[PDB]
């Protein structure tokens, strides 16, 4: 899209309508006359445009109103409310801009941010930008969280986030104009290679893929038209519903085979009953011929009855010879109706062992995408966020993604090697208790008006807790934590001295032998400028290979690559790295998924702040104190970096509205 309407689209906003968030700050306008809405919407889209066209420098209200024209520049408070809503909620002046009016000299309010993943960093930058004292507590000795980036010599390779999923409407677009990121498009072509080491032939490839996507439509139709969402009091997972669909596709291969052969029997038995009428005229004729012959043995002259006997047996015998001739016709039809049906046999199988194993690779792809076995995914809801997909090519960050968290960390009080242990929030403030990860003994105490928690969902899930909430989190929050899924996927990075692969396909599949291994080393990535190949361990495999050495793992890697490229075209890798995200105690997993039994609404539960009870009984209701951000908190963009970043911006605007007040609602 283009113009001011493109700025609304690149801010994930409808250009022609007011969002629920805007109705909240501008209820005057949304209940007001359509013309003011159109005015409002224009200042909205125009200011977004202004910011978007130059995201490297702060967009002051002065600069905004300066470039507004009548009729719109005629109301300066509307333009001030709009610009301040936009700025408060991270739609403008987010990220890494040159601040025009340098930072307020003295700060207001103190925020503790747990974790410096991208969500934490995104809030900290906004909160500080808003004049608050923000400091971040980070258990690792680095920022980024699950944006991990291997670097050695000229080798770079992301073991966490790795792909910008398209720039259309993507906040990572703005960040990339603000930050050197080598964004390289990722080319669609992905050839699959069976366990033998040899291409799936275009023929199969395109049948299996299409049958896969038809199976997905089916599960969707099962869920949404047939309401097939509980079975034996448990919620149907996607993996289950795919089985029920395949089995009904196998029941139907047989159902149709059974009716086709039941058509051969219906005709092999009309032919039976007819070859019986015909065996019974060839003998009613065998004897009328005897009789006619004997009647002809009488030599003339014959009395008239003996003449009639010859004549009558003759008329009789040709009548039956018409009959037996009229049946060898009808015998000639049914005899051909049969290798009509015998020559058009219905489908023999639904899918062969070779088909299923390719259909497995598409399931390993859904298991990668959700970082979990399909048996855990919600059937109804696993893809509940598809409407929000960005447009455009996916991209890779050729200089390593870590380059982004690092850039975002610039300018910020970050305490590395500080492991939060207890979060204590009360009606009057919060204290966060943390230890130093090197010598646990060193104990730290941070007091603050509010804590922004960006702990990974897998951390929040630990039994027994890595982090104690005092007072404990209310049930509604802990249930959302226990309902929601936190998946797992891992990465094997292979560093060679030579490019032994197709240097112009970015990615290629490997088809696994068993269903049980469908995830193991199923996809390879050629993304980087040095000879680096990157392999994925998805599905149930991910959980398994964590208990297997690097060597056994890089072994199975080189095996695949040998089998696929030539035992001898595949050198030894000069460096190898295997991720283990479920074992990483600051992740405890990779990213979240809509578990069977969960919905996208659990994501919203996760983002609701906590309000502590009153200290003094009978005292007015507090202020909320415990805020949550992070990938697992953003329903419309889960499991991603951009979703994490967006959730940081969300909380920063929500905290600041709380503790700095929202002057832009009147």
């Amino acid at each position: 899209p283009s113009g001011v309407e493109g700025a609304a689209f690149q801010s994930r906003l409808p250009h022609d309508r007011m969002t629920s968030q805007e109705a909240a700050c501008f209820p005057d306008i949304i209940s007001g006359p359509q013309q003011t809405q159109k005015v409002f919407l224009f200042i909205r889209n125009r200011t977004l445009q202004l910011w978007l066209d130059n995201p490297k420098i702060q967009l002051t209200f002065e600069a905004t109103l300066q470039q507004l024209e009548a009729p719109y520049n005629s109301d300066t408070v509307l333009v001030h409310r709009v610009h301040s809503y936009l700025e408060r909620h991270g739609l403008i002046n987010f990220g890494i801009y040159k601040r025009i009016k340098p930072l307020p000299t003295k700060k207001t309010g103190k925020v503790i941010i747990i974790g410096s993943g991208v969500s934490g960093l995104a809030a900290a930058r906004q909160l500080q930008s808003f004049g608050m004292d923000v400091t971040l507590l980070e258990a690792r000795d680095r920022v980024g969280g699950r944006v991990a980036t291997f670097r050695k010599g000229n080798y770079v390779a992301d073991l966490g986030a790795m792909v910008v999923t398209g720039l259309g409407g993507n906040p990572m677009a703005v960040v990339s104009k603000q930050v050197n990121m080598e964004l390289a498009k990722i080319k669609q072509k992905c050839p699959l290679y069976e366990a033998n080491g040899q291409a799936v032939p275009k023929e199969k490839d395109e049948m299996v893929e299409q049958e896969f996507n038809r199976l997905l439509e089916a599960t969707s139709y099962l869920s949404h038209q047939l309401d097939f969402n509980v079975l034996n009091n448990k919620p149907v997972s996607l993996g289950q519903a795919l089985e029920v669909v395949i089995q009904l596709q196998e029941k139907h291969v047989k159902d149709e085979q059974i009716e086709h052969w039941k058509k051969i029997v219906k005709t092999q038995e009309e032919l039976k009953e007819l070859l019986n009428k015909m065996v019974n005229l060839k003998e009613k004729i065998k004897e009328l011929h005897q009789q006619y012959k004997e009647a002809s043995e009488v030599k003339p002259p014959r009395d008239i009855t003996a003449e009639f006997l010859v004549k009558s047996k003759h008329r009789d015998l040709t009548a039956l010879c018409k009959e037996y001739d009229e049946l060898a016709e009808t015998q000639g039809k049914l005899e051909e109706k049969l290798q009509e049906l015998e020559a058009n046999p219905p489908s023999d199988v639904y899918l062969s062992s070779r088909d299923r194993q390719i259909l497995d690779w598409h399931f390993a792809n859904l298991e990668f995408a959700n970082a979990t076995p399909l048996s855990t995914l919600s059937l109804k809801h696993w893809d509940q966020d598809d409407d929000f997909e960005f447009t455009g090519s996916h991209l890779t960050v050729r200089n390593g993604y870590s380059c982004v968290p690092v850039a975002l960390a610039e300018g910020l009080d970050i305490k590395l090697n500080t492991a939060v242990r207890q979060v204590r929030y009360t009606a009057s403030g919060c204290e966060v208790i943390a230890v130093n990860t090197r010598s646990t003994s060193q104990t730290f105490i941070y007091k603050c008006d509010a804590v922004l928690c960006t702990l990974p969902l897998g951390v929040l899930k630990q039994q027994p807790p890595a982090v104690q909430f005092v007072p404990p989190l209310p049930e509604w929050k802990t249930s959302a934590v226990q309902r929601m899924g936190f998946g797992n996927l891992n990465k094997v990075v292979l560093c060679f001295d030579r490019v032994f692969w197709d240097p112009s396909v970015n990615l290629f599949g490997h088809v696994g032998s068993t269903t049980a291994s469908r995830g193991e080393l199923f996809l390879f990535w050629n993304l980087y400028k040095a000879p680096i190949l990157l392999a994925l361990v998805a599905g149930e495999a991910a959980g398994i290979m964590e208990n297997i050495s690097d060597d056994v793992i890089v072994g199975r890697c080189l095996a695949i690559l040998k089998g696929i490229f030539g035992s001898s075209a595949v050198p030894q890798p000069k460096e190898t790295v295997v991720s283990r995200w479920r074992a990483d105690p600051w992740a405890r997993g990779s990213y979240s998924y809509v578990a069977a039994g969960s919905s996208g609404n659990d994501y919203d539960l996760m983002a609701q702040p906590i309000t502590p009870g009153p200290s003094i009984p009978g005292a007015p209701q507090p202020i909320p104190r415990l805020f949550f951000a992070g990938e697992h908190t953003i329903r419309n963009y889960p499991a991603t970096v951009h979703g994490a970043l967006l959730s940081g911006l969300r909380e920063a605007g929500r905290i600041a509205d709380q503790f700095l007040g929202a002057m832009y609602t009147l």
Partner: peptide
């Protein structure tokens, strides 16, 4: 979720 998919992006069940 499905939005994560780069290789061989699935399509069934997705609104076209």
């Amino acid at each position: 979720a499905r939005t994560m998919q780069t290789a061989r992006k699935s399509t069934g069940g997705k609104a076209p």
